[PDB]
Amino acid sequence: LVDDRMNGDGTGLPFGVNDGILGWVIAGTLGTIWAIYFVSQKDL
Amino acid sequence: SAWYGPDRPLFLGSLSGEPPSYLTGEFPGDYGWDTAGLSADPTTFARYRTIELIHARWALLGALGIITPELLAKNGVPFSEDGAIWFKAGAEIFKEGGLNYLGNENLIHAQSILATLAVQVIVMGAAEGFRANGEAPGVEGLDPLYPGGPFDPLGLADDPEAFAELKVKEIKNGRLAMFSCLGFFVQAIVTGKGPIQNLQDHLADPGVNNAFASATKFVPTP
Amino acid sequence: TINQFYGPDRNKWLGPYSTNTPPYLTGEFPGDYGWDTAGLSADPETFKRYRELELIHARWALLGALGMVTPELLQDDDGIMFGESAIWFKAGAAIFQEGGLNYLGNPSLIHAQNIVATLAVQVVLMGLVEGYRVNGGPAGEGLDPLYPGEAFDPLGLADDPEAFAELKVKEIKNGRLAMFACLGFFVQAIVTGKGPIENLTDHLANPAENNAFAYATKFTPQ
Amino acid sequence: PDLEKWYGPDRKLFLPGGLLDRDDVPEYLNGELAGDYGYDPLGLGKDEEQVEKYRANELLHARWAMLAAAGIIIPEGLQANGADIKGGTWFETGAEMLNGGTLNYFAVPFGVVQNPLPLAAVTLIEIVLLGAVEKFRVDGTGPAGFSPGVGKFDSDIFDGLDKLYPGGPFDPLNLADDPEVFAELQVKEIKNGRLAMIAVLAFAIQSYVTGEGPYANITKHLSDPFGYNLLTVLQGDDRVPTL
Amino acid sequence: MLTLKIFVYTVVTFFVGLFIFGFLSNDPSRNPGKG
Amino acid sequence: KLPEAYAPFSPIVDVLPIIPVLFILLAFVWQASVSFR
Amino acid sequence: LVLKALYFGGVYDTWAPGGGDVRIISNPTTNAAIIFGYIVKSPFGGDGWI
Amino acid sequence: FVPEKPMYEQGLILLPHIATLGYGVGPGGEVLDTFPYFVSGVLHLISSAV
Amino acid sequence: MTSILQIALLGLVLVSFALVVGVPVVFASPNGWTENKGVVFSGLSVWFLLVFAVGVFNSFA
Numbered sequence: 020l021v022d023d024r025m026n027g028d029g030t031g032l033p034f035g036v037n038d039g040i041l042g043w044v045i046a047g048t049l050g051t052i053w054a055i056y057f058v059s060q061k062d063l
Numbered sequence: 064s065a066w067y068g069p070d071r072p073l074f075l076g077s078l079s080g081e082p083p084s085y086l087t088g089e090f091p092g093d094y095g096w097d098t099a100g101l102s103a104d105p106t107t108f109a110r111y112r113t114i115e116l117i118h119a120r121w122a123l124l125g126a127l128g129i130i131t132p133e134l135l136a137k138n139g140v141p142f143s144e145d146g147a148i149w150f151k152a153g154a155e156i157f158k159e160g161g162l163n164y165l166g167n168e169n170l171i172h173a174q175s176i177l178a179t180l181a182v183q184v185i186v187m188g189a190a191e192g193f194r195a196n197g198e199a200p201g202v203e204g205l206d207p208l209y210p211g212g213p214f215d216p217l218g219l220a221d222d223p224e225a226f227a228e229l230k231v232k233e234i235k236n237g238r239l240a241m242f243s244c245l246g247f248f249v250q251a252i253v254t255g256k257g258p259i260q261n262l263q264d265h266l267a268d269p270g271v272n273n274a275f276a277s278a279t280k281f282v283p284t285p
Numbered sequence: 286t287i288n289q290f291y292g293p294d295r296n297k298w299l300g301p302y303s304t305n306t307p308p309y310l311t312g313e314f315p316g317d318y319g320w321d322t323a324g325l326s327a328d329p330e331t332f333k334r335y336r337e338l339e340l341i342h343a344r345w346a347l348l349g350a351l352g353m354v355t356p357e358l359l360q361d362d363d364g365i366m367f368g369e370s371a372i373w374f375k376a377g378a379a380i381f382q383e384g385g386l387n388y389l390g391n392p393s394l395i396h397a398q399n400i401v402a403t404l405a406v407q408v409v410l411m412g413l414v415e416g417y418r419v420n421g422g423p424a425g426e427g428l429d430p431l432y433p434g435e436a437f438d439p440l441g442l443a444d445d446p447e448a449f450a451e452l453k454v455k456e457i458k459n460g461r462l463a464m465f466a467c468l469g470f471f472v473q474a475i476v477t478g479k480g481p482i483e484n485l486t487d488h489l490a491n492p493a494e495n496n497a498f499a500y501a502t503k504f505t506p507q
Numbered sequence: 508p509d510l511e512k513w514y515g516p517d518r519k520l521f522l523p524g525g526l527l528d529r530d531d532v533p534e535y536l537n538g539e540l541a542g543d544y545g546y547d548p549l550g551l552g553k554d555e556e557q558v559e560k561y562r563a564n565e566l567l568h569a570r571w572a573m574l575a576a577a578g579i580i581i582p583e584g585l586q587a588n589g590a591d592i593k594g595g596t597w598f599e600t601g602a603e604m605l606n607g608g609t610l611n612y613f614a615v616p617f618g619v620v621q622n623p624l625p626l627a628a629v630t631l632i633e634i635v636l637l638g639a640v641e642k643f644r645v646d647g648t649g650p651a652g653f654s655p656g657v658g659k660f661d662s663d664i665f666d667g668l669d670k671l672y673p674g675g676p677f678d679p680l681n682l683a684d685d686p687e688v689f690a691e692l693q694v695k696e697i698k699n700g701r702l703a704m705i706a707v708l709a710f711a712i713q714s715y716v717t718g719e720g721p722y723a724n725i726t727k728h729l730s731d732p733f734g735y736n737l738l739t740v741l742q743g744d745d746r747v748p749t750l
Numbered sequence: 751m752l753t754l755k756i757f758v759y760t761v762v763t764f765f766v767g768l769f770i771f772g773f774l775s776n777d778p779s780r781n782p783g784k785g
Numbered sequence: 786k787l788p789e790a791y792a793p794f795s796p797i798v799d800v801l802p803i804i805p806v807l808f809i810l811l812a813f814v815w816q817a818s819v820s821f822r
Numbered sequence: 823l824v825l826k827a828l829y830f831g832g833v834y835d836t837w838a839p840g841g842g843d844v845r846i847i848s849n850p851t852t853n854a855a856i857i858f859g860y861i862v863k864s865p866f867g868g869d870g871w872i
Numbered sequence: 873f874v875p876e877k878p879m880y881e882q883g884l885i886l887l888p889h890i891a892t893l894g895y896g897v898g899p900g901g902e903v904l905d906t907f908p909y910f911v912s913g914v915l916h917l918i919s920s921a922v
Numbered sequence: 923m924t925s926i927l928q929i930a931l932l933g934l935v936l937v938s939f940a941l942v943v944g945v946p947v948v949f950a951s952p953n954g955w956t957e958n959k960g961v962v963f964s965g966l967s968v969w970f971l972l973v974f975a976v977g978v979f980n981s982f983a
């Protein structure tokens with residue numbers, strides 16, 4: 020090899036996830052928006 | 064969902080019948096599950112209620128402390144294989160590297176279990192003794208089961224009906240966590256692997272990788 | 286007569302040597318010999334609950350203790366009917382062999398291979414009938430929770446009161462006999478790992494050196 | 508409970524309201540007998556008293572066919588599954604005992620019992636006992652008792668009862684005093700009986716057509732439905748391959 | 751180089767989460783009409 | 786092809802697909818016959 | 823469709839050796855990992871979603 | 873239907889739907905028989921009438 | 923056997939044709955569904971009988 024590539028193209032990666040930190044930050048962002056929405060639900 | 068009053072949900076649904084007369088639905092976690100009647104005397108009821116709640120909190124804490132380290136171990140955090148599975152974590156202090164929190168050499172790094180348990184006894188004896196009095200240095204006298212105040216900096220115990228439904232939420236989550244914790248002690252005794260590893264192997268083939276695969280391990284021999 | 290077991294001078298747990306009888310156990314209900322040295326039946330409604338789960342425990346122990354040795358009784362000389370699964374504490378492995386779960390050695394009886402499916406049917410059906418036991422339904426609702434006797438008593442029998450008293454203490458004594466025998470079953474499964482009838486034959490061959498003293502070395506922590 | 512769905516002027520019919528008017532039912536069906544669906548296209552119903560007369564024949568017929576259906580499905584299933592029944596298939600069971608043959612009883616769970624009873628004595632005791640119980644049915648006299656319905660009843664308990672629905676010793680589990688649950692179980696019993704006798708006619712027809720037992724029929728049908736059905740067994744063999 | 755992927759995935763899930771909970775959040779009542 | 790027992794009915798078979806298209810067109814005849822009410 | 827694929831001896835597999843064969847499917851892969859990874863992947867030529 | 877040709881040049885869309893179920897399919901893919909397709913069509917027509 | 927099946931199928935075609943031309947007219951007829959019930963039942967019973975006849979005649983043809 021002549022360069023360092025991600026090498027995840029294809030291979031059946033669910034949601035294109037190849038490392039766990041990306042799935043963890045996806046779940047973290049969705050959970051953060053969900054917590055904000057839930058605590059600030061019912062308008063007030 | 065009317066978690067108090069006479070129309071409270073019960074421990075068997077519509078087939079629950081008559082709830083006990085000494086449990087009319089004033090306290091959270093009320094479903095009438097009183098088949099043996101351990102709580103006839105109200106003082107005994109109070110002691111069991113405090114015991115249940117303290118165990119609920121401890122079970123919630125143990126649930127995260129038993130799920131998080133192996134998740135981090137399988138998610139790139141360099142735990143040793145000894146301390147990644149919870150029932151062997153106490154054996155990590157016997158190694159040359161000490162107890163490495165999150166696999167860090169210069170973090171914690173304790174090698175004297177004697178002094179660790181000594182300071183543990185002192186700190187937790189002080190904490191539980193201050194719990195037992197209901198009075199602490201800087202803390203006035205109030206409800207011992209539900210202190211709040213310094214223990215509730217967020218201030219979510221101010222409003223009554225939300226405080227009551229949050230009490231219900233707390234006791235039900237504690238009951239779920241104590242199912243989980245007793246389950247983890249069961250897999251620890253039987254399977255000898257971590258609970259997340261057990262779920263992982265169960266997802267490979269749920270037909271054979273379940274509780275029935277370990278029914279013949281403890282059978283005696285003559 | 287009736288007063289031999291329900292009088293104030295009834296049969297006790299020491300005969301004529303039970304001078305300090307508890308005051309609340311007057312001999313009204315079946316049994317009531319006064320064996321409450323732990324004093325755990327002080328409260329009345331709790332004593333009722335413990336009595337009800339006592340009779341339930343007794344009846345299901347009667348089924349268990351009787352059904353322990355029936356397959357071992359029907360075991361033949363070599364075991365075409367059942368292999369290693371004729372023994373009580375090896376009966377569950379009757380689902381995992383290459384043939385299935387045959388009731389009495391033939392494919393025409395039961396012949397199941399989905400232990401999970403029979404588990405689900407067992408759980409749903411008998412949890413439902415427990416709900417019927419505690420609330421009511423097709424059989425009866427407002428009857429005595431311990432002693433209904435309406436659809437479960439079709440052969441007459443239950444109509445005479447002194448007969449009730451006699452064959453109810455017959456219940457409690459037969460149930461306690463099976464209860465004690467079942468403890469024997471589990472502990473002989475633990476300390477020896479050998480079947481009850483074969484242990485009985487080994488003892489009647491030579492009672493001298495064959496006793497539990499022959500297995501007192503087995504639990505020695507070497 | 509819920510007797511209005513089967514009893515009363517408005518009830519389930521053999522055709523719904525959009526296709527059958529409520530006035531096309533003949534007058535002698537007004538919703539008082541079990542199984543009242545208003546299905547009398549020909550002139551066999553005539554009037555309610557003749558309906559009551561055929562009701563006894565219909566109920567005993569339904570019960571007999573229900574016993575026949577159960578005693579057909581069970582022993583052939585036991586034979587196909589491995590039980591030593593020796594003649595489980597229903598329309599060869601008489602051909603076993605002619606010269607020196609016998610039968611075997613598989614009474615669950617402790618069956619496998621060799622019967623030495625000869626056919627002549629069996630037929631004699633069968634005809635005598637069925638004639639005696641039939642005379643007891645039609646004339647309402649019984650010599651002895653000791654039934655779970657009531658302990659040690661006398662001979663004069665059948666008088667004053669009702670024909671085809673007599674209470675007492677014929678209800679060992681009781682639970683028939685209440686009129687609502689009694690009528691519900693009545694409709695349930697008569698519908699179960701007609702399901703059972705339609706089944707019985709189907710077992711006989713499938714026997715005469717395929718030459719094998721009906722449990723074998725349904726097991727082969729579930730083995731391959733399109734390779735074993737009405738048109739397949741009535742086809743015969745192979746079928747020229749139609750390009 | 752995967753750092754760019756992590757950043758863009760985070761912001762995409764952020765915008766999608768805004769969309770999902772915005773339409774989960776009682777959207778049909780955001781109308782001047784009598785409904 | 787059809788089997789031997791059904792071969793003469795193939796021309797009768799050969800006109801079916803237009804019938805669903807004639808159903809909406811029949812609905813148009815219906816709507817014109819009620820004079821577009 | 824399950825009954826046809828496992829118990830009625832039908833449906834053609836194109837991947838049988840020699841050019842395919844109508845094959846009664848034994849041991850189908852029902853596991854949640856492969857099924858859900860089949861439903862949550864990219865719709866492009868790298869994998870193809872469905 | 874022309875039986876000697878491969879069965880995709882005849883402008884047929886749903887006989888592949890029946891043939892994917894393997895109903896009358898040879899080892900290599902030969903059509904063999906057309907009666908399952910015929911009986912499927914007739915049962916559909918009677919169901920359509922009711 | 924082929925001729926019997928062919929005649930039965932032709933009769934089934936004519937019966938279904940009669941049902942097609944009659945059922946909507948009779949249904950949408952003012953006070954017609956309650957008076958043509960017998961002939962509609964006869965047509966449907968005949969239609970089903972010829973369907974089952976062609977079905978049982980396939981296996982002999």
Ligand code: CHL
Pocket residue numbers: 275278279280281282283373374375376377378379380381400403404471474475
């Ligand atoms: C009171 C119920 C009950 C008991 C006592 C047992 C006991 C046993 N089962 Mg078992 N089962 C029971 C119910 C059920 N089983 C099964 C399905 C199976 C299977 C599939 C298998 C077993 C097997 C076994 C044996 C495992 C070997 C061993 O040393 O185990 C632990 C037992 C001891 C150390 C002996 C002491 C027992 C004593 C502590 C029990 C009494 C108190 C308990 C806490 C029970 C409390 C009530 C509730 C929780 C059941 C064992 C003797 C296996 C076997 O036979 O292998 C040869 C096997 O393969 N069981 C089902 C589902 C239908 C059950 C449903 O209720």
Ligand code: CHL
Pocket residue numbers: 392393394395396397398399400402403406577580581582584585588615
């Ligand atoms: C996985 C494969 C599997 C296979 C191959 C079989 C195969 C069989 N199982 Mg099964 N089972 C299997 C799984 C399972 N079984 C069961 C639970 C049972 C039970 C509880 C029974 C069977 C029985 C049977 C047999 C039924 C055939 C028969 O007798 O037909 C001929 C019979 C019929 C078609 C119907 C007969 C019904 C019977 C109740 C008649 C009673 C008549 C009385 C007049 C009742 C009157 C009562 C009151 C109202 C007065 C058969 C050999 C039966 C058996 O072993 O019988 C000896 C049986 O009783 N299975 C479970 C748990 C859910 C399974 C789980 O996987």
Ligand code: CLA
Pocket residue numbers: 074086090091092093094095096097100101102108111112113114115118238241242245
């Ligand atoms: C040891 C923890 C603990 C304690 C001290 C209590 C205490 C109490 N519970 Mg509670 N509960 C618990 C755990 C506990 N619970 C769990 C795990 C569940 C879920 C099953 C529940 C669900 C529950 C309901 C639905 C209700 C109560 C109620 C009550 C009150 C009256 C009942 C009573 O006195 O029984 C005394 C309890 C004990 C003596 C604990 C004995 C523990 C032994 C060792 C059990 C051994 C076997 C056990 C079944 C474990 C097997 C595995 C298990 C996970 C299935 C009382 C204050 C009632 C209430 O209204 O609350 C105010 C009521 O409605 N509980």
Ligand code: CLA
Pocket residue numbers: 119120121123124127208209210211212214215217219220226229230232233236237
């Ligand atoms: C999800 C479980 C749960 C829930 C619903 C509650 C709910 C409640 N607790 Mg409580 N508690 C819990 C767990 C829980 N607790 C555990 C495990 C402990 C042991 C550390 C305690 C110890 C405790 C004390 C000492 C007191 C309370 C009190 C209260 C009441 C008011 C406080 C409040 O509303 O804050 C808000 C509650 C929440 C927003 C839910 C908690 C969700 C957090 C964010 C998750 C934290 C996990 C995170 C990874 C950190 C790990 C834990 C770490 C701090 C050790 C309230 C009804 C006070 C009281 O009794 O009222 C007068 C009080 O005195 N709790």
Ligand code: CLA
Pocket residue numbers: 298310314315316317318319320321323324325326332335336338339342461462464465468
């Ligand atoms: C779990 C089974 C069980 C239960 C719930 C009961 C319950 C009861 N028994 Mg009973 N008993 C049992 C088993 C049981 N018994 C057995 C097997 C025997 C035969 C030895 C007896 C013989 C007996 C007599 C003679 C009398 C009673 C009486 C009573 C009643 C009041 C006494 C009491 O409350 O003690 C408390 C019981 C419990 C808290 C539950 C028992 C479970 C324990 C804690 C665990 C096992 C104990 C021990 C370790 C077993 C191993 C030793 C073994 C070799 C015996 C009460 C309702 C008295 C009565 O008034 O009759 C109605 C009476 O005089 N019992």
Ligand code: CLA
Pocket residue numbers: 344345347348431432433434435437438442443449452453455456459
């Ligand atoms: C020898 C133990 C024994 C005794 C003395 C009694 C006595 C009594 N029972 Mg009881 N019962 C028992 C065991 C016993 N039972 C068991 C083990 C079960 C669970 C199956 C039951 C379940 C039960 C119910 C549901 C009810 C009673 C009731 C009653 C009362 C009246 C009816 C009766 O059973 O008459 C006594 C009859 C006998 C003692 C005959 C027993 C001889 C048998 C046939 C020996 C053969 C055993 C056999 C191999 C076991 C397998 C059979 C199995 C498939 C069922 C009476 C006080 C009724 C009640 O509540 O009171 C009103 C009632 O509703 N029992």
Ligand SMILES: CC1=C[C@H](O)CC(C)(C)[C@H]1/C=C/C(C)=C/C=C/C(C)=C/C=C/C=C(C)/C=C/C=C(C)/C=C/C1=C(C)C[C@H](O)CC1(C)C
Pocket residue numbers: 096097098099100101118119121122124125126127128129148149150151152153240241242244245
């Ligand atoms: C109610 C009633 C009534 C009726 O009537 C009767 C009866 C039956 C009696 C009843 C019931 C009861 C019950 C069930 C109970 C139970 C409870 C529980 C389960 C608890 C737990 C509870 C649980 C718990 C606390 C838990 C805890 C946990 C923990 C601490 C852990 C810790 C840890 C961790 C983190 C990790 C590491 O590495 C290790 C350690 C360090 C170790």
Ligand SMILES: CC1=C[C@H](O)CC(C)(C)[C@H]1/C=C/C(C)=C/C=C/C(C)=C/C=C/C=C(C)/C=C/C=C(C)/C=C/C1=C(C)C[C@H](O)CC1(C)C
Pocket residue numbers: 320321322323324342345346348349350352353373374376377464465467468
């Ligand atoms: C009273 C008193 C008073 C004083 O003072 C104090 C004290 C001490 C507390 C006391 C006493 C107590 C006691 C004695 C107790 C006991 C208990 C028991 C016996 C248990 C067991 C118990 C036991 C039991 C039930 C058992 C049962 C059994 C069974 C079911 C079985 C089953 C089975 C069978 C059939 C067979 C198969 O193959 C298997 C199975 C399926 C598994």
Ligand SMILES: CC1=C(/C=C/C(C)=C\C=C\C(C)=C\C=C\C=C(C)\C=C\C=C(C)\C=C\C2=C(C)CCCC2(C)C)C(C)(C)CCC1
Pocket residue numbers: 910911912914915918919920922973974975976977978980
């Ligand atoms: C002609 C022919 C044939 C024959 C045939 C036959 C003989 C038979 C049949 C058949 C059939 C027979 C078919 C069918 C159909 C059916 C259907 C189509 C059904 C239905 C039903 C429904 C649709 C229901 C509805 C409902 C109701 C009303 C109630 C409730 C709700 C529900 C929705 C469930 C074949 C093909 C072989 C060959 C050629 C010729």
